Amino acid sequence: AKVQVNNVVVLDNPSPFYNPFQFEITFECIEDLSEDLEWKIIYVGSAESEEYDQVLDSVLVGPVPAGRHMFVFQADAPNPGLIPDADAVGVTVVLITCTYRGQEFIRVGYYVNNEYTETELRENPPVKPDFSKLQRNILASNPRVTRFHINWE
Amino acid sequence: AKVQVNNVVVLDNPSPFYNPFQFEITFECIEDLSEDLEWKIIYVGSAESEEYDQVLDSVLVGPVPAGRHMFVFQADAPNPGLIPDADAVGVTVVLITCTYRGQEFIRVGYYVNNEYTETELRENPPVKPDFSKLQRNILASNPRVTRFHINW
Amino acid sequence: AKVQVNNVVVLDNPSPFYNPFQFEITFECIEDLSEDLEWKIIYVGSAESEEYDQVLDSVLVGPVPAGRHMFVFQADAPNPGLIPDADAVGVTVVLITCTYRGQEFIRVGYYVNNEYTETELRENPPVKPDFSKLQRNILASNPRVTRFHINWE
Amino acid sequence: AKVQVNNVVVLDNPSPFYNPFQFEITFECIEDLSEDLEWKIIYVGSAESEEYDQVLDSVLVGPVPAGRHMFVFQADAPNPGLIPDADAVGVTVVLITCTYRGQEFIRVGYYVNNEYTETELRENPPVKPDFSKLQRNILASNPRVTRFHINW
Amino acid sequence: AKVQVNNVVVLDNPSPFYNPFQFEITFECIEDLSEDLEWKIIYVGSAESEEYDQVLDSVLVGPVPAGRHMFVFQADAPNPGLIPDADAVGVTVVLITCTYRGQEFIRVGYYVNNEYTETELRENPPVKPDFSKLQRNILASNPRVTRFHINWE
Amino acid sequence: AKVQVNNVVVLDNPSPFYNPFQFEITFECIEDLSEDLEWKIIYVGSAESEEYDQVLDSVLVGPVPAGRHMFVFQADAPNPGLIPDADAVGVTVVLITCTYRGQEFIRVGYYVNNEYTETELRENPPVKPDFSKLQRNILASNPRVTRFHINW
Amino acid sequence: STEEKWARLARRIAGAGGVTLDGFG
Amino acid sequence: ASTEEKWARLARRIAGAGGVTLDGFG
Amino acid sequence: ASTEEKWARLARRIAGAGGVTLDGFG
Amino acid sequence: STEEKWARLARRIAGAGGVTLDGFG
Amino acid sequence: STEEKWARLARRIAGAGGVTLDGFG
Amino acid sequence: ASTEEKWARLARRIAGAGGVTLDGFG
């Protein structure tokens, strides 16, 4: 692999559901890259179907010379209108992927717990989720990191 | 890969069920291809069985020189007589595939939501689907893109 | 692949259950073959078990020189005595395979719908299927084509 | 593959359960083999577990020169005391395998139907199977042939 | 493969549950080995979980010169205190594995039937198994032999 | 493989739930490694989901010269607040992994039994687990060792 | 089930180890 | 059969087999 | 357990694993 | 089921054809 | 089930990634 | 869900994926 992800620091966590995602990403480039790296933040709106995935942001990083690199990757909150009611409250997943020449080489996944903070709403959740009262808590202590063999050319 | 699909723009979306599909496809050719590229639009009439697929259109593009290319891929609506009643209303998928030398290298998939727009129809859906009243809404914000390794 | 199947035209479709299968097959040979191609027509008598497959016909085509080739592949109807009653009426599969030196490189499958044409029999199907009244309708608009990597030697 | 199985002819079929299996096997050797070919006949006594397999016979053929070869492979009937009662009457399978250098390159499988021929037995099958009254009918019209890649 | 297992003869079979396992193993070495072969006898105490496996014995054989070799592999009976009650009576598995440089190249498995021999205990098995009255009968007529591709160096 | 794990000795076993894990690890290096070896101790807090993993400790060993090496790998107890009530009492697993160049080549797994030692607690387990009264017993007699192919 | 039947027929059509496509063509 | 089985069936149709499916081109 | 599961079990015994099963030699 | 949901989320995290590890790091 | 038990024992016998045969021999 | 499913889940965690799991080092 020409690119190695050293760490992902989860920032502004926990946060209100409507607040942006912020990740500080540190990566090492073993040798100069002529093309760009494409990073994405993907929110899994529903464990039941990939139909509910939302690409929250996508960014091109490059040209990338050899050495250690850092950047803050920000993304707006998911659109609640595309989240099924049954999945809104409870645990879901947020993904950070990076591709080089259309090929995914790394996937970082975090479990995300969306819950009410009010004892009232927690015990008796409304049928129609109240997103303005939901707190997103990314489980930053447990990053799930997957690497994939790709053609670095 | 000698061919890379850069983007697919979904056009005339949403539309009545009987209206044609329209996709603007942009792709890049890394080097000159001696063979043709074969594009298809495939409508999955039923999640339960591949028996209900409708290849809506198929097109040969080529010879393909190196560089950037764009084209509008149109296809007629699926035949409602081949769609099972249980699958007509609700979610299904539409695919866009491209082959080189008869080998599939790209598959672009979109979830498609077919629903009534009329309040009375939405609340009380007829047993026999009324296709003339269904609206097709392709979920263009979520393209699912699959690349396959082929022999170029 | 030294052999590419260009098309299969389904002929005499639909037909009475007892009538023969007829397929017009067009294929291209990229370079001369010293051995024969073996084509088969296989009727899946039952989705529940491969025990009920019936090889309806098998044919040797060759020696095959380079260029485009066409032939009509005919096969007799399946034997109804080997078809389970539960599978006789409804949808099943018919396959066309080709091997080169014992290796299958192509499989063409068609869904086949066997139904009564009489409103009477359609609504009230007899417990013991009446094959003389069954119509076979091959779904020719949907060929399912599978190619397999083989050693062309 | 240095060895190709051309055909298997099922002989003395159908037969009483206690009668031997008989298969006429034809095969082709592409070049001279320095090692032996090991053929086996394996009776699956139970679809529920491989614990109930009975290797009925095993034979070494070799050295094998290039060219065409034929032989009759016979095997004694399976032991009924090792067959579970629930599997005795109905469908099971028999296999013919061949190894080279301890590597399986061919597996030929036949479905086998074991039934009573006596009307009273057929209608009212005993709880304890009566093997002396079972007829074995190998489905010879449907050989299922599996080739495996080996190191020749 | 530099090592080929020719046969395993099961000895002192059947036996009381507390009696040792005894296997006569014959193997051929195609060419001299500089390192040792490691043989193990593994008793599967429970089909429900690998937690209940018991390695009964492990032995180093070597240096192994080319040619045919034989040895008697003995192992003490499994510890009944580690066998779940639900698995004690009935069929289980015993395994013989061999590794070369930490890599498993052969696995020989036998079904093992543990049963009471007394008509009384057979018909009415106690809730707490009576291991002193259990007979182990290895199904020696049906060895299940698995070979795995390994790096022979 | 440039690194071979020879043995893992489980120490201070069994222990109170809050006491640290202690493993004596012996390994062999076939040639000098230019990179570091990364060892981890991972507690599976729940068989139902990887969400409940606790990496208890992580350590960098290196540069590693050729030859035999031994070290004691210690790790603090898992956080009980992150363990689901349904998983607290009964069987779970603990893992020891080692990576080279970010590639996992060895995984050592132990089943862990967490139970009360007090008779009244054993017979009537509280709804809210009492971690101060749980005993952790690692099944040290059954290490489950998985080797993976990596790029050395 | 009715879905299991469909999946069984699809497996017979596809065989194993290949790439199944709609049409030739 | 179930609502989840329908979703999984549609996802399999989208992905085909032997490829790598990603969200977007991007 | 079921009649279908029996058929699938017999088919697995016929095929073994890692091979290509065809109807006939042919 | 609740377990099926967890398995579905784990599949989304892992994707396919890779090696998933806890942490980087 | 009783069949699940048999399948579990068969998996223990076979391990994974190999070719299982009846006998040596 | 069941007691067996729990055991299988724990075994998968022990094994990871793409490796060869053995009892002992040995």
User: According to DSSP H, which parts of chain D are helical?
Assistant: 85-88, 119-123
Block residue for tokens 């069984």? G8
- Reduced to 3 states (helix: H, G, I; strand: E, B; else coil), residue A25 is strand
**Alpha carbons K4 and L4: distance in angstroms, whole number:** 10
Q: Which tokens in the block code for residue E48?
A: 């429900």
Do residues B37 and B64 touch, judged by C-beta distance below 8 A?
A: yes
Handedness of CA F132, F134, F136, F137 (dihedral sign): positive
E strand or H helix that includes residue C85: helix C85-88
Handedness of CA G20, G23, H3, H7 (dihedral sign): positive
Residue in C95, D146, G13 with CA at minimum distance from that of residue I25: D146
Q: Which tokens in the block code for residue C107?
A: 């499989």
Do residues F10 and F64 touch, judged by C-beta distance below 8 A?
A: no
Resolution in A: 2.0
**Alpha carbons E101 and E95: distance in angstroms, whole number:** 19
Angle among Cα B119, B122, B125 to the nearest 5 degrees reads 130
> What's the DSSP call for residue D142?
-
> What's the DSSP call for residue A51?
G
Block residue for tokens 């030398």? B101
**Alpha carbons C139 and C112: distance in angstroms, whole number:** 6
Distances (CA, A) of E70 to A70, E2, E11: 62, 16, 14
**Alpha carbons K15 and E50: distance in angstroms, whole number:** 12
Do residues I11 and C49 touch, judged by C-beta distance below 8 A?
A: yes
**Could J24 and A7 be called an inter-chain contact, meaning their C-beta atoms sit closer than 8 Å?**
yes
Residue in H23, F39, J11, L10 with CA at minimum distance from that of residue A109: J11
Block residue for tokens 């002992």? L24
* Neighbouring chains to G with at least 3 Cβ pairs closer than 8 Å: B, C, H, I
Other CB atoms within 10 Å distance of the CB of residue F14: 16
Half-sphere exposure of C92 (CA within 13 A, CB side): 28
Cis ω for the linkage preceding E63 (within 30 of 0): yes
Exposed, middle or buried by CB within 10 Å (0-12, 13-18, 19+), for E104?
Answer: buried
Half-sphere exposure of C133 (CA within 13 A, CB side): 13
Do residues H7 and A49 touch, judged by C-beta distance below 8 A?
A: yes
**Alpha carbons B51 and G8: distance in angstroms, whole number:** 12
**Alpha carbons B53 and B44: distance in angstroms, whole number:** 5
> What's the DSSP call for residue E125?
-
* A22 Cβ neighbours under 8 A, 6+ residues apart: A10, A11, A12, A72, A73, A74
Block residue for tokens 């966590």? A13
**Could B93 and H14 be called an inter-chain contact, meaning their C-beta atoms sit closer than 8 Å?**
yes
Do residues B28 and B42 touch, judged by C-beta distance below 8 A?
A: no
**Alpha carbons A55 and B141: distance in angstroms, whole number:** 8
Residue in C64, C58, C72, C115 with CA at minimum distance from that of residue C92: C115
**Could C104 and I20 be called an inter-chain contact, meaning their C-beta atoms sit closer than 8 Å?**
yes
* K13 Cβ neighbours under 8 A, 6+ residues apart: D50, E93, E95, E107, E109, E111, E144, E146, K20
Do residues A138 and A96 touch, judged by C-beta distance below 8 A?
A: no
Residue in A68, A148, A137, A57 with CA at minimum distance from that of residue A100: A148
Domains annotated for chain A, with CATH where assigned, are 1-153 (2.60.40.1490)
**Could C91 and B51 be called an inter-chain contact, meaning their C-beta atoms sit closer than 8 Å?**
yes
Do residues F78 and F54 touch, judged by C-beta distance below 8 A?
A: yes
Q: Which tokens in the block code for residue B52?
A: 């209900």
User: According to DSSP H, which parts of A12-148 are helical?
Assistant: 85-88, 119-123
Q: Which amino acid is residue A14, in one-letter code? A: P
Q: Which residues pair with A152 in a beta bridge?
A: none
- Reduced to 3 states (helix: H, G, I; strand: E, B; else coil), residue B33 is coil
Do residues E25 and E73 touch, judged by C-beta distance below 8 A?
A: yes
Residue in F65, F78, F71 with CA at minimum distance from that of residue F26: F71
> Which chain A residue is nearest to residue H15, measuring alpha carbons?
A50
* Neighbouring chains to A with at least 3 Cβ pairs closer than 8 Å: B, F, H, J
DSSP for I2-24 reads -HHHHHHHHHHHHH-SSSEEEE-
**Alpha carbons D13 and B148: distance in angstroms, whole number:** 49
Q: Technique behind this structure?
A: X-ray
Q: Which tokens in the block code for residue G13?
A: 């059509």
Distances (CA, A) of B125 to B52, B91, B136, E36: 22, 15, 16, 74
Do residues B54 and B21 touch, judged by C-beta distance below 8 A?
A: no
**Alpha carbons I18 and J15: distance in angstroms, whole number:** 25
Which residues on chain C are in Cβ contact (under 8 Å) with B81?
none
Residue in E40, E41, E17, E37 with CA at minimum distance from that of residue E29: E37
Task: Measure CA C32 to chain center.
Answer: 26
- Reduced to 3 states (helix: H, G, I; strand: E, B; else coil), residue K14 is helix
- Cβ of residue I12 closer than 8 Å to a chain D Cβ: no
**Could G21 and B49 be called an inter-chain contact, meaning their C-beta atoms sit closer than 8 Å?**
no
Block residue for tokens 């395979």? C97
Residue in A95, A37, A102 with CA at minimum distance from that of residue A71: A37
Nearest to E142 among D53, D102, D103 (CB): D53
Mutate to test the interface with B, among C106, C142, C149 (most CBs of B within 10 A): C142
Residue in D125, F29, K2 with CA at minimum distance from that of residue L4: K2
Contacting G with CB below 8 Å, chain H residues are 1, 5, 9, 16-18
Q: Which tokens in the block code for residue D79?
A: 């032991």
Distances (CA, A) of L20 to E148, F107, K18, L17: 10, 10, 11, 9
Block residue for tokens 């599969």? C93
Task: Measure CA F102 to chain center.
Answer: 19
Residue ranges of E strands in C1-148 = 3-11, 15-16, 21-29, 37-44, 53-61, 67-75, 90-100, 103-116, 134-138, 144-147
Residue in B140, A118, A5 with CA at minimum distance from that of residue H25: B140
* F114 Cβ neighbours under 8 A, 6+ residues apart: F17, F88, F89, F90, F91, F92, F134, F135, F136, F137
Q: Name the CA radius of gyration of chain I, rounded.
A: 11
Residue in F26, F21, F23, F22 with CA at minimum distance from that of residue F7: F26
Q: What are phi and psi of B108, to 5 degrees?
A: -110, 125
Q: What are phi and psi of C12, to 5 degrees?
A: 40, 60
- Burial state string for A79-108 with b = 16 or more CB within 10 A and e = fewer than 16: ebebbeeebbbebbbbbbbbbbbbbbbbbb
User: According to DSSP H, which parts of chain E are helical?
Assistant: 85-88, 119-123
DSSP for D39-72 reads EEEEEES-TT-GGGEEEEEEEEE-S--SEEEEEE
Distances (CA, A) of C31 to A86, C57, C107, D128, E44: 59, 27, 21, 62, 56
Angle among Cα B63, A35, B148 to the nearest 5 degrees reads 50
Q: What are phi and psi of F91, to 5 degrees?
A: -90, 135
User: According to DSSP H, which parts of chain H are helical?
Assistant: 3-15
> What's the DSSP call for residue E20?
P
Q: What are phi and psi of A88, to 5 degrees?
A: -55, -50
Q: Which tokens in the block code for residue A153?
A: 């050319």
Handedness of CA E26, E30, E34, E35 (dihedral sign): negative
Do residues F112 and F78 touch, judged by C-beta distance below 8 A?
A: no
E strand or H helix that includes residue A18: none
Block residue for tokens 């039941």? A48
Residue in E117, E63, E119, E114 with CA at minimum distance from that of residue E89: E114
Q: Which tokens in the block code for residue D134?
A: 């079972």
Distances (CA, A) of K11 to E49, E146, K3, K7: 11, 11, 12, 6
Angle among Cα I1, K17, F95 to the nearest 5 degrees reads 90
* Structural gaps in chain J: residues followed by a C–N separation over 2.5 Å: none
Residue ranges of E strands in A20-66 = 21-29, 37-44, 53-61
Q: Which residues pair with B67 in a beta bridge?
A: B29
* Neighbouring chains to F with at least 3 Cβ pairs closer than 8 Å: A, E, J, L
- Burial state string for C73-112 with b = 16 or more CB within 10 A and e = fewer than 16: bebebbebebbeeebbbebbbbbbbbbbbbbbbbbbbbbb
Q: Name the CA radius of gyration of chain D, rounded.
A: 17
* Chain D from 110 to 129: CB within 8 A of any I CB: 111
* B147 Cβ neighbours under 8 A, 6+ residues apart: A102, A103, B1, B105, B106, H19, H20
Q: Which tokens in the block code for residue F51?
A: 């969400």
